[PDB]
RNA sequence: GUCGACGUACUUCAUAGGAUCAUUUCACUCUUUGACUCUUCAAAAGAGCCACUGAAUCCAACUUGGUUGAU
């Protein structure tokens, strides 16, 4: 279609079935970053409020990844590659909203945690240590 | 200390006859063993993660029937 996607549909045999597909953000991004120290995959956002992460080699195979009726957009990214595999090591914050959620880059799927200004503000800016 | 001769005890010094063994179709019932699946006296992980779909169990909600008696 229009929204830079294709998707394999094949009857299964009686109904057709989501086989295989490929997309990305059909609205131009919003803020990206760099995941890795070796050039390999990014971290993508966007304002149809979808979330990719990309690779950069010859492939250009892709993950979108794994929210789990989409979030509110994001204004403010931060990232850190020092503990992946373990925990949550992507914060991000939304338009109009108070808590900044979390992500893990290693299961590519959403955080665990909601986090609070205590101060009934919109988040501003984020930041990760070393 | 050693050797000569006397004594006592010890063990050991028998290997009979004859056999044997090498060389001269069709079906039913029952019995034994092994394999597959699962499980009891028990720890792990990987090919580890996200999707769309399918099935089950429990608690809540809804209907049916029940003191002229459900369990």
Redesign the pocket.
Known sequence: GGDNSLKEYVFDPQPP??LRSRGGHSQPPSYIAFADSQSHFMLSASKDRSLWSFSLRKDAQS?EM?Q?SKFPEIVALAIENARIGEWENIITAHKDEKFARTWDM????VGRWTFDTTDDGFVKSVAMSQ
Do not use: E, V
């Open positions: 079935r989501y993950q794994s789990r290693r299961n590519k799927r």
